Coordinates of C-alpha atoms in Angstrom, one line a residue:
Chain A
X1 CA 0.0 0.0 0.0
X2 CA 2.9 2.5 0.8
X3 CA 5.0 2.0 -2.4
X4 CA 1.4 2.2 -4.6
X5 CA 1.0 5.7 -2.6
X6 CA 4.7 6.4 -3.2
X7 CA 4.3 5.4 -6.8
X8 CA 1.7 8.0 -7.0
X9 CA 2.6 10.6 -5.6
X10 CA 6.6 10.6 -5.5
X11 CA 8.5 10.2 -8.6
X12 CA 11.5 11.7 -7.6
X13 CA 12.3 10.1 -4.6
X14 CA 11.9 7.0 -6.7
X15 CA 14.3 7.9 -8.9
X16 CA 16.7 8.5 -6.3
X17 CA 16.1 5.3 -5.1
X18 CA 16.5 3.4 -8.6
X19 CA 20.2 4.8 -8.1
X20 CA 20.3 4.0 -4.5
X21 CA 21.7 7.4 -3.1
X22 CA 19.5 8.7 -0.6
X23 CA 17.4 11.3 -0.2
X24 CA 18.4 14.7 1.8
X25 CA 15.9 16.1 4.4
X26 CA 13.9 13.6 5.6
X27 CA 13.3 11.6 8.9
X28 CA 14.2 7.9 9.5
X29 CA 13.4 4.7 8.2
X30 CA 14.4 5.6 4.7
X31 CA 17.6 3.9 4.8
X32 CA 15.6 1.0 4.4
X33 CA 13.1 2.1 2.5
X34 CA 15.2 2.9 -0.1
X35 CA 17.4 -0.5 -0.8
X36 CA 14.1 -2.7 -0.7
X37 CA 12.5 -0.7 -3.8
X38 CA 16.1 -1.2 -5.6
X39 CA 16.1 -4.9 -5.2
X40 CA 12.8 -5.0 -5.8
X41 CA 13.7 -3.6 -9.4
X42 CA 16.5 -6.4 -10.1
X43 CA 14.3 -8.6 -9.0
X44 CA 11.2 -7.7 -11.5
X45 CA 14.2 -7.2 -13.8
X46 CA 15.4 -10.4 -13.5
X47 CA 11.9 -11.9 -13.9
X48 CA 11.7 -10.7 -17.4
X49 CA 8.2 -8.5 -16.9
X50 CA 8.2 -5.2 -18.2
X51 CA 10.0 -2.8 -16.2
X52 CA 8.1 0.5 -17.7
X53 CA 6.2 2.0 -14.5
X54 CA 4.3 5.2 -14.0
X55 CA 6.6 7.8 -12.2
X56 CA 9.2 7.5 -15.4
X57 CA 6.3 7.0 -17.9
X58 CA 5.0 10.6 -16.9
X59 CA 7.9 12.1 -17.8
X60 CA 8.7 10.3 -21.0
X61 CA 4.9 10.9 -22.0
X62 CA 5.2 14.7 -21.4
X63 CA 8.5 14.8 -23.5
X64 CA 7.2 12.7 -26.0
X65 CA 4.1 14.8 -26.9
X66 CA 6.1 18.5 -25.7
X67 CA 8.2 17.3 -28.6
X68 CA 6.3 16.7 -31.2
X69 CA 4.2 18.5 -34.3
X70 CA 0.4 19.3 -34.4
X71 CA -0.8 16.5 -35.6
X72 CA -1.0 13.1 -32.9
X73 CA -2.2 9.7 -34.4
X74 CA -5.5 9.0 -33.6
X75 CA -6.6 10.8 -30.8
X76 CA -10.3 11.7 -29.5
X77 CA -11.3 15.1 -30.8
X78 CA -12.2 16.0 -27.2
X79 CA -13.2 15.1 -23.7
X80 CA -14.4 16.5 -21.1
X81 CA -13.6 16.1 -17.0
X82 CA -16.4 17.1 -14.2
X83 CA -17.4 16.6 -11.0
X84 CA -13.9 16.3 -9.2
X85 CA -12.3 18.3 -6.9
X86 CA -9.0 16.8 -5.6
X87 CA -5.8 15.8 -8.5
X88 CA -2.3 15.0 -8.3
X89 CA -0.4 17.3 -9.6
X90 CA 1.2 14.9 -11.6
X91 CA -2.7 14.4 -14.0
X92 CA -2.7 17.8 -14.1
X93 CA 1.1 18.6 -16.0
X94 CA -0.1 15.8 -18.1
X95 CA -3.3 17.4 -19.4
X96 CA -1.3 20.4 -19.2
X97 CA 0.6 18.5 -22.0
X98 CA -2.5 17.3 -23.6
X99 CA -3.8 20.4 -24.1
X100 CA -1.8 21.5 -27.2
X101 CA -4.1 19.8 -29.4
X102 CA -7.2 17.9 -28.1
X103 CA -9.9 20.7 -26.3
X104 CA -11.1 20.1 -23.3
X105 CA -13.2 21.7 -20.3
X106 CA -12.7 21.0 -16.8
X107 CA -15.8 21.7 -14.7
X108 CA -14.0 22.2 -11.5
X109 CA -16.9 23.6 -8.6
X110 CA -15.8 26.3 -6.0
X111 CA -17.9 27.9 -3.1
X112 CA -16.9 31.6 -3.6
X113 CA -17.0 33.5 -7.0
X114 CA -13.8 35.3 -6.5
X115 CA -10.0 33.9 -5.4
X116 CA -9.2 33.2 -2.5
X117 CA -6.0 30.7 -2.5
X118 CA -2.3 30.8 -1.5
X119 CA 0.2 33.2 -2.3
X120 CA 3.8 32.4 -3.5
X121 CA 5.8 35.6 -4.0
X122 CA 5.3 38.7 -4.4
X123 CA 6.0 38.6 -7.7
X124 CA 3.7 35.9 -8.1
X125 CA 1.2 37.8 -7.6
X126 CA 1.8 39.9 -10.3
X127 CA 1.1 36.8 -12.6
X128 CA -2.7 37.0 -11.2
X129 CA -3.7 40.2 -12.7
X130 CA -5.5 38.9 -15.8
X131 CA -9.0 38.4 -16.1
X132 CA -11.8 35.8 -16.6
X133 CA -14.7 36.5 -19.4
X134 CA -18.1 36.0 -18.7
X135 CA -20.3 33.5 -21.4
X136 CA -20.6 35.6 -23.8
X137 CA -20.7 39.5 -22.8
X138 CA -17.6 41.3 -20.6
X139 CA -15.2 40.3 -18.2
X140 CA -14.7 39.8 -14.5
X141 CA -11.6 40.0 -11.7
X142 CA -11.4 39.8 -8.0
X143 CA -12.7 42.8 -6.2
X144 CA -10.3 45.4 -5.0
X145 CA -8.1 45.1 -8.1
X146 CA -5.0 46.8 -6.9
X147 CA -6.0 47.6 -3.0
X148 CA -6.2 43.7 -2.4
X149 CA -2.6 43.5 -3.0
X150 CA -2.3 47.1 -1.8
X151 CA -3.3 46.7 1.8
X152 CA -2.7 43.5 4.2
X153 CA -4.7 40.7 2.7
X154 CA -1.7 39.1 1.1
X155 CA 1.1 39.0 3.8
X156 CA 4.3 37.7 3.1
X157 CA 4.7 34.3 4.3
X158 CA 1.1 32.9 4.7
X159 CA -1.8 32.7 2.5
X160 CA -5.2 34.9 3.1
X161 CA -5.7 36.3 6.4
X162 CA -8.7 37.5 6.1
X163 CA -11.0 34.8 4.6
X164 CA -13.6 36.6 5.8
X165 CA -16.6 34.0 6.2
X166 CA -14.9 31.8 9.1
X167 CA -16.5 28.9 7.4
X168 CA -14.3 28.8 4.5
X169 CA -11.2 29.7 6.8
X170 CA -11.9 26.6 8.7
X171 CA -13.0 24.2 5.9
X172 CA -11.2 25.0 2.7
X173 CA -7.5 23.6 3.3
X174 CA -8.2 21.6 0.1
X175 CA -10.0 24.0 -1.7
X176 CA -7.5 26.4 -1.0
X177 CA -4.2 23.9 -2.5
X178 CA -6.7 22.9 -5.3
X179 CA -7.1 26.5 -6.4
X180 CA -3.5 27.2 -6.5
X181 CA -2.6 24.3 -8.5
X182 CA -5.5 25.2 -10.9
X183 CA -4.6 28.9 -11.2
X184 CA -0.6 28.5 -11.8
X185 CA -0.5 27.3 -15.5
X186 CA 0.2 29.2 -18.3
X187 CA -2.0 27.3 -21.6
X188 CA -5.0 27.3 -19.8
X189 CA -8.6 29.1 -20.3
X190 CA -10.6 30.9 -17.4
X191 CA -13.9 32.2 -17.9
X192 CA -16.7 32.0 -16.1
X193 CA -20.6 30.6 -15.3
X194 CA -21.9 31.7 -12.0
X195 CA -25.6 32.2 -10.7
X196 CA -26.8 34.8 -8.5
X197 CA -28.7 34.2 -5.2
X198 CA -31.5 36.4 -3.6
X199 CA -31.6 36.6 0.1
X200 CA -34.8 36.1 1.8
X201 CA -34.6 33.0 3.7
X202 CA -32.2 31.7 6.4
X203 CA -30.5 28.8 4.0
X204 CA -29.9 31.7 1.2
X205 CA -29.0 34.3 3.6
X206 CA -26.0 31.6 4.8
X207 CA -25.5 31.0 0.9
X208 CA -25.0 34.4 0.1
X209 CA -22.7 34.8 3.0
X210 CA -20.3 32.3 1.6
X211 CA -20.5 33.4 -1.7
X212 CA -19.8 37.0 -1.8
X213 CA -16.8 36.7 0.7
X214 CA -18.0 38.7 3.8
X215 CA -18.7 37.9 7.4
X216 CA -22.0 39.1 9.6
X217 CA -20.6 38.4 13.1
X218 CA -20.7 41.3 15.7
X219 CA -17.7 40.7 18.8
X220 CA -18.6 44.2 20.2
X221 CA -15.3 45.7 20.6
X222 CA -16.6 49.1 22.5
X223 CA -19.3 48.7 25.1
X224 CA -22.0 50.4 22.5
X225 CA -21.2 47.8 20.3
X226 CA -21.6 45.0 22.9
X227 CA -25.0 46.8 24.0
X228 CA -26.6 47.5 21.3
X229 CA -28.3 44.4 19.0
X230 CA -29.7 45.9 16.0
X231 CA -26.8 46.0 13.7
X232 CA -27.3 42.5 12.1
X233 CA -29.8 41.6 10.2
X234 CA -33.6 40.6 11.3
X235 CA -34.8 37.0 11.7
X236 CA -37.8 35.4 10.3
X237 CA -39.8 33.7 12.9
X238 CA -40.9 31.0 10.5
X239 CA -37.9 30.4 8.6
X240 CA -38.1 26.6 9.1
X241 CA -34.9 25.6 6.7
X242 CA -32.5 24.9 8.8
X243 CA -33.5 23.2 12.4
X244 CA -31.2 21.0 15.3
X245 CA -33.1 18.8 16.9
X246 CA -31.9 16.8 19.7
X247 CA -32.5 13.1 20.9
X248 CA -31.7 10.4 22.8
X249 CA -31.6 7.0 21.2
X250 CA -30.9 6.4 17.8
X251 CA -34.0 4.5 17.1
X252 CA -36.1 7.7 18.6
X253 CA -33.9 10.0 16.6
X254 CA -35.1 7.9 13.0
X255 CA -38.8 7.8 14.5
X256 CA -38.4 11.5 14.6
X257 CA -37.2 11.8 11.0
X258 CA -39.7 9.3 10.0
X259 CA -42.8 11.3 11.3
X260 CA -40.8 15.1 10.5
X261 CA -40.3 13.7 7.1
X262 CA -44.5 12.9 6.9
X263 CA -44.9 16.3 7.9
X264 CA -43.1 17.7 6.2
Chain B
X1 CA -7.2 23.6 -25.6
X2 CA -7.2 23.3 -21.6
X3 CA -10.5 25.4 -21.0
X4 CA -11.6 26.1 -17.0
X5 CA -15.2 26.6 -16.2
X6 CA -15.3 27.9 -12.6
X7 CA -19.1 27.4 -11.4
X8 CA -21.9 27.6 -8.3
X9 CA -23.9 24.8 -9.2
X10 CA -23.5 21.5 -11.6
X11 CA -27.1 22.4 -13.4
X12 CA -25.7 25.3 -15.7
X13 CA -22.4 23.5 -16.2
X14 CA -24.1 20.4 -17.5
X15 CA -26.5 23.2 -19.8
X16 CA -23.2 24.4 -20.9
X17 CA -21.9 21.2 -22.0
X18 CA -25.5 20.4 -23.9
X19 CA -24.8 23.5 -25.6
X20 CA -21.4 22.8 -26.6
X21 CA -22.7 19.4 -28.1
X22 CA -25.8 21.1 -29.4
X23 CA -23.7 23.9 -31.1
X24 CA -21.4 21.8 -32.6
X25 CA -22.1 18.2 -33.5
X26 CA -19.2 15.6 -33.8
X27 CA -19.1 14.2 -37.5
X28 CA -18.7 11.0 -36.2
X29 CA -21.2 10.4 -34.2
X30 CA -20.8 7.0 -33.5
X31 CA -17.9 8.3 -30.9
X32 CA -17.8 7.5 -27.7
X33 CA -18.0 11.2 -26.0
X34 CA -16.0 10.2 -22.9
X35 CA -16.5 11.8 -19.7
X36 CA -14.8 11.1 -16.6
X37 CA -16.1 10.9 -13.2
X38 CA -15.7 10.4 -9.4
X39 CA -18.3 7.6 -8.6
X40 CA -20.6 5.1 -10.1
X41 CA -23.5 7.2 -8.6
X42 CA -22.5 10.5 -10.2
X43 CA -22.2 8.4 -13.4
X44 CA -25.8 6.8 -13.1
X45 CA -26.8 10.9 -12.6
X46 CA -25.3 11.9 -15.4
X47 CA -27.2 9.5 -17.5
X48 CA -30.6 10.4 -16.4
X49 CA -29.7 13.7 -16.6
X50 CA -29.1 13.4 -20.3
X51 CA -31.1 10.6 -21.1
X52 CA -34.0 13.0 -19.5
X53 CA -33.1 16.1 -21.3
X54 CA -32.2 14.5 -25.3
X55 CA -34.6 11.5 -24.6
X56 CA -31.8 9.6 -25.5
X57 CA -28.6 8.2 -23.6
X58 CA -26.1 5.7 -25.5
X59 CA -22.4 5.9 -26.6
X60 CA -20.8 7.9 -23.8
X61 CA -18.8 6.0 -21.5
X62 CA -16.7 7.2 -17.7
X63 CA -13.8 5.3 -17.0
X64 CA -11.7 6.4 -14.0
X65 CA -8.9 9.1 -14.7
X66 CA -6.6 5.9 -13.7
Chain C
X1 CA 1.3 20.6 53.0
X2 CA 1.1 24.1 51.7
X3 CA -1.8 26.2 49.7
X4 CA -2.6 26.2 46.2
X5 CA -3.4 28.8 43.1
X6 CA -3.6 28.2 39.5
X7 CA -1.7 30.9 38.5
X8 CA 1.2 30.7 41.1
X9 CA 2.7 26.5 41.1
X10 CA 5.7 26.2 39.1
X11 CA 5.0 23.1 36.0
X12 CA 8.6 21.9 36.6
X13 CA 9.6 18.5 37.3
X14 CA 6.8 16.1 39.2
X15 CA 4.4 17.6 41.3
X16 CA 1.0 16.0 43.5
X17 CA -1.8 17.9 44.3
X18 CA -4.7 16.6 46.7
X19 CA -7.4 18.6 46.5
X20 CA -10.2 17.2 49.2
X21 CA -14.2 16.3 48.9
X22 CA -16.1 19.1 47.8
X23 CA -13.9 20.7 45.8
X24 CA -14.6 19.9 42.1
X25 CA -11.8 18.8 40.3
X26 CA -12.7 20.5 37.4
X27 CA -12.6 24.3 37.2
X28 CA -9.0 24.1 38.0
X29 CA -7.7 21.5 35.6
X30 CA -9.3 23.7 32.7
X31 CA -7.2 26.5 34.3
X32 CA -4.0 25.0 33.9
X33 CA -4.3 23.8 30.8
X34 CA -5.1 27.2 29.5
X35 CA -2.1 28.3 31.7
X36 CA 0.1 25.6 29.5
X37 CA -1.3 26.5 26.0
X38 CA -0.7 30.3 26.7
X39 CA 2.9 30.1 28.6
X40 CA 1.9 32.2 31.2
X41 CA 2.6 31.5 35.1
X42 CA 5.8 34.3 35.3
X43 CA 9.7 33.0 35.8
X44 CA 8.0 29.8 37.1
X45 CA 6.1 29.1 34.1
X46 CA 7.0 26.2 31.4
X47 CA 10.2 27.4 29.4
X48 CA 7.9 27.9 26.1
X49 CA 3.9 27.5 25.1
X50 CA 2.6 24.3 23.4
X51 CA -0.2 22.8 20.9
X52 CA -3.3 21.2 21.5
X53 CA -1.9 18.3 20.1
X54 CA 1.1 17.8 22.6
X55 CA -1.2 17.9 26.4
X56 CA -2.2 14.1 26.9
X57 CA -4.6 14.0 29.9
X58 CA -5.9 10.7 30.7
X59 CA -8.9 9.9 32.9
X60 CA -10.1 6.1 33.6
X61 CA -14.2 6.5 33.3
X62 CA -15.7 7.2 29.5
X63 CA -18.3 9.4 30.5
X64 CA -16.2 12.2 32.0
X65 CA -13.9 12.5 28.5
X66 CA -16.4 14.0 26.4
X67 CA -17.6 16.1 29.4
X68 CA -14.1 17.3 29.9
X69 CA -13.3 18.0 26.3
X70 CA -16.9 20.2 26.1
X71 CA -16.2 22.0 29.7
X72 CA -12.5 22.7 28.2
X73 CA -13.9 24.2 24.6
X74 CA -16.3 26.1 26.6
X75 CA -13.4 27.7 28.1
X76 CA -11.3 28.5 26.0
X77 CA -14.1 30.1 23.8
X78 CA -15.0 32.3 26.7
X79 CA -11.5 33.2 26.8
X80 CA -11.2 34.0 23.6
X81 CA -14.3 36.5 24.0
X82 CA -13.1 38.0 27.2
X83 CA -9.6 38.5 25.3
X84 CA -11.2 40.5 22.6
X85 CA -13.3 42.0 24.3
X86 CA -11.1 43.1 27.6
X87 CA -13.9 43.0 29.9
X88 CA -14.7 39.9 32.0
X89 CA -16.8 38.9 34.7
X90 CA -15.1 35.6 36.4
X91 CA -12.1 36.8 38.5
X92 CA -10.1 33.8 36.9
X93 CA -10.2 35.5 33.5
X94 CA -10.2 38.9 35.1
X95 CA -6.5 37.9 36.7
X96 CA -5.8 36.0 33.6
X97 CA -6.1 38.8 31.9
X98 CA -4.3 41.1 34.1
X99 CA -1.5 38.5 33.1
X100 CA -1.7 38.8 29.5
X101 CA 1.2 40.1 27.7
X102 CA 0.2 40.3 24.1
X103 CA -3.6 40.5 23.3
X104 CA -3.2 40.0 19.6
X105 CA -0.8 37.3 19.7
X106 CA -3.2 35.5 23.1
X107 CA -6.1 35.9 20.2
X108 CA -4.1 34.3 17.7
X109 CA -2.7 31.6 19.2
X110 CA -6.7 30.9 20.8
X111 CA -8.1 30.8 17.1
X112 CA -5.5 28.7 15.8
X113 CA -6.0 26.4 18.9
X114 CA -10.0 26.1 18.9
X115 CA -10.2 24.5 15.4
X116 CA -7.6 21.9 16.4
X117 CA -10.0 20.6 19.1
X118 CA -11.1 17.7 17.1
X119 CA -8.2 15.4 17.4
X120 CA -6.7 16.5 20.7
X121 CA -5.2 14.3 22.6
X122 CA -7.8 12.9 25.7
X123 CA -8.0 9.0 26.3
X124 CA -8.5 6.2 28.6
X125 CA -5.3 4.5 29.7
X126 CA -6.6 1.6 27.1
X127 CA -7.1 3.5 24.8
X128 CA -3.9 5.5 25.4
X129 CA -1.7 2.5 25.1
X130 CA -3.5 1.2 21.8
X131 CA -2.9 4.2 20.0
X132 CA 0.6 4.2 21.4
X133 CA 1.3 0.5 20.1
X134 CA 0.0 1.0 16.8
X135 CA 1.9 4.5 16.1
Chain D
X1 CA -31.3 21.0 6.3
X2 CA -32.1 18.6 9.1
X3 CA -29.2 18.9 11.6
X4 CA -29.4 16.2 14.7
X5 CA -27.1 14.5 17.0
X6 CA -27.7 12.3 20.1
X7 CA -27.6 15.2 23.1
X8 CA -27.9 13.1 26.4
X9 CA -27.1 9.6 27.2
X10 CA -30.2 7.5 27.9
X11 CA -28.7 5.1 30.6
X12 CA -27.4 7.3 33.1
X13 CA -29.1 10.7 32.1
X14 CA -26.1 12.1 31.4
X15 CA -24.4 14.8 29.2
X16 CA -22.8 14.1 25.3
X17 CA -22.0 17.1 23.2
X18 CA -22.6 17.8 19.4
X19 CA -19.3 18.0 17.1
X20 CA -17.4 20.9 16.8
X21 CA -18.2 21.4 13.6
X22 CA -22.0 22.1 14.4
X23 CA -20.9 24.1 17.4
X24 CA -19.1 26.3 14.8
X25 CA -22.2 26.5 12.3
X26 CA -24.4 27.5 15.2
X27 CA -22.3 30.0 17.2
X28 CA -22.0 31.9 13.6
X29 CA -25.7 31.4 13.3
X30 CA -26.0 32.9 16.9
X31 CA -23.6 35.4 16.1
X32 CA -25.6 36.4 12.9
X33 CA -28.7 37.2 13.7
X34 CA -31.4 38.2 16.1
X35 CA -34.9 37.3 16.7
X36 CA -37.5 40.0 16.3
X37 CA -38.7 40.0 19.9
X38 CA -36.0 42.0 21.7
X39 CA -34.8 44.0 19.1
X40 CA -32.1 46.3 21.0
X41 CA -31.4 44.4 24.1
X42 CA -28.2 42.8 24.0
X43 CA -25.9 41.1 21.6
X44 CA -25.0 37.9 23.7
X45 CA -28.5 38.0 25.8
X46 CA -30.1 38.1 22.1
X47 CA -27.5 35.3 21.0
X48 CA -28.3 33.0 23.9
X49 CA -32.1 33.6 23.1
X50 CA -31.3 32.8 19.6
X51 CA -29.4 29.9 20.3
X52 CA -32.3 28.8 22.8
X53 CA -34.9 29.7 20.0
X54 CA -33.5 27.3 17.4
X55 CA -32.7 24.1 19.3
X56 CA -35.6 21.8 19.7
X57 CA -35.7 19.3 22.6
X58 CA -37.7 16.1 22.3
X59 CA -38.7 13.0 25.2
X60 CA -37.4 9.8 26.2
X61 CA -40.5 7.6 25.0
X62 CA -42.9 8.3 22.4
X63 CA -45.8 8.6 24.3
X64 CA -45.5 11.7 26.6

């Protein structure tokens, strides 16, 4: 299970290992981790099988089409990836590589409309001042255009202080790696297909929250603050969307949801 | 050409893809338009989805990325 | 055979505290472990602050983990408030905050501890050992 | 959405507690907003009313 995850993920520790030096910077147990992947190669070597694996075959697959002219033997006119929202790296230098001549469209999903990811360098972030088209009409950028990277939402060593909604903060760690790898290459196309939300009940009000990149919690810094309760917004006392109910016994708890879901 | 669709929701992504195949049709029909998925269940959505929007699913097929 | 405050025994070396019926057990245990995860405790506190994921505290019954681990989030959430807000009401976070060096870096340090609360590190001694042996 | 946990154990009557997770989504929901009742009163009192608002409570056996 641990050299399929290493064959995976790792190619260039691999390759160290193929040569048997080790590799700099990294805890113990690789002094033997190394030397039984090398035998492990004469061995299958000496077995006669085929010897071509996956962390080389990437490579050689990306040189072999990098080199090459515009027209591939027979190849899909195009294909199209959806629904998935974690990658290795590794899939996405080869489509990166595929790209040149067959089209296709990834249809990644994200929660907010605007970026929100890591930052490398400051001049990195110079890289991110394009701009994504709509369908068919105009363009569109992340808001504050220069007085994002103006003020201190990018600091120097970290990623985005201030998220904003603390949901996000707390729950995008892949979203957040996912977005950087998908924003970094250079042959790619990004436009954009949002929908709008109207806020009138609870669920959409929470919706809206997330997606336009904001927060609505008061921590009453000055005693006014703390006294007063008016600054947020009102509460419909029907709004029946989102409810916590709590139980006992697990059979109760499906009774309830049996009889709720009758009701309802 | 590497194209990225960001999105809110899967229901205008999937209209934009029907528009894509509506708005140009493959000569060869016959093709296998593959499309790659997560699951078996996203699969098994995908086809009713299109088989309930063309009133007709056949010839597209989702292997694993793998 | 002499007194005791949270805010005053040094956490060097190995130290036993009896603390007789009727006294709770409780509200000071949350009190040093806030003491450990913020440094604090003058010359005689620990030489530098940890993570939530480095103070093991083992108990023996299962019912008082999860009520330990909710009485502990509770606290630390109210600290967190108090922090922000420099105005408390318990005299344990009044002192505590008398203490407080650096409100920004206290508040910090709090949000980045409070998220980590699922996986911290409370057991039973059996269930201590087994995920000992199997690490 | 239909959010529910076990709250209290049944042998022993005593406490469990709800993930933090949920704890999260309903101190920001807490935090949010307030009900319509006591409009300027306080922003915790009208947080802990909100918070007491929202949860629902149900019974040991069905027919009580």
């Amino acid at each position: 299970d641990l050299f399929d995850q290493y064959l995976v993920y790792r190619p260039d520790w691999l390759a160290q290992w193929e040569t048997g030096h080790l590799v700099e910077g990294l805890g113990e147990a690789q002094a033997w981790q190394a030397p039984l992947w090398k035998a492990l190669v004469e061995y299958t070597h000496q077995l006669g099988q085929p010897r071509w694996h996956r962390a080389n075959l990437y490579q050689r697959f990306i040189e072999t089409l990098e080199s090459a002219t515009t027209c591939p033997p027979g190849l899909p006119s195009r294909v199209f990836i959806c629904g998935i929202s974690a990658l290795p790296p590794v899939y996405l230098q080869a489509l990166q590589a595929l790209g040149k001549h067959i089209e296709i469209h990834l249809l990644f999903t994200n929660p907010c409309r605007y970026y929100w990811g890591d930052i490398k360098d400051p001049a990195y972030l110079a890289k991110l001042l394009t701009r994504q088209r709509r369908h068919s009409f105009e363009d569109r950028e992340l808001p504050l255009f220069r007085d994002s990277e103006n003020a201190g939402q990018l600091f120097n060593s970290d990623g985005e202080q201030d998220v904003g909604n603390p949901l996000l903060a707390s729950w995008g760690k892949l979203g957040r790696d996912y977005i950087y790898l998908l924003s970094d290459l250079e042959s790619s196309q990004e436009l954009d297909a949002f929908v709008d939300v109207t806020p009138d009940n609870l669920l959409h009000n929470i919706q809206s929250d997330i997606l336009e990149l904001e927060n609505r919690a008061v921590a009453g810094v000055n005693i006014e603050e703390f006294s007063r309760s008016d600054n947020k917004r009102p509460l419909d006392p029907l709004d029946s969307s989102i409810t916590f109910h709590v139980c006992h016994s697990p059979q109760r708890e499906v009774e309830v949801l049996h009889d709720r879901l009758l009701a309802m | 050409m590497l194209r990225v669709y960001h999105s809110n929701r899967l229901d205008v992504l999937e209209a934009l893809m029907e528009f894509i195949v509506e708005r140009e049709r493959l000569d060869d029909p016959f093709e296998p338009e593959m499309i790659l998925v997560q699951s078996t269940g996203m699969a098994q959505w995908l086809q009713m989805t299109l088989s309930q929007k063309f009133g007709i699913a056949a010839n597209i097929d989702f292997p694993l990325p793998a | 055979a002499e007194t005791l405050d949270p805010l005053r025994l040094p956490l060097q070396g190995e130290r036993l505290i009896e603390a007789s019926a009727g006294t709770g057990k409780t509200f000071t245990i949350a009190a040093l472990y806030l003491r450990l995860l913020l440094g604090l405790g003058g010359s005689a506190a620990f030489p530098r602050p940890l993570t939530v994921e480095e103070l093991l505290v083992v108990t023996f019954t299962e019912a008082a983990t999860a009520e330990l681990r909710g009485r502990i989030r509770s606290n630390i959430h109210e600290l967190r408030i108090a922090c922000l807000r420099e105005t408390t009401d318990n005299p344990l976070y009044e002192r505590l905050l008398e203490e407080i060096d650096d409100k920004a870096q206290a508040a910090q340090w709090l949000l980045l501890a409070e998220r980590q609360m699922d996986e911290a590190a409370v057991f039973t001694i059996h269930g201590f050992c087994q995920r000992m042996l199997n690490l | 959405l239909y959010i529910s946990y076990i709250g209290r154990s049944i042998q022993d009557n005593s406490e469990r507690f709800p993930s933090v997770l949920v704890q999260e989504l309903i101190d920001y929901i807490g935090q949010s907003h307030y009900l319509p009742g006591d409009e300027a009163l306080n922003c915790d009192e009208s947080e802990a009313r909100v918070k007491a608002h929202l949860t629902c409570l149900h019974t040991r056996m069905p027919f009580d």
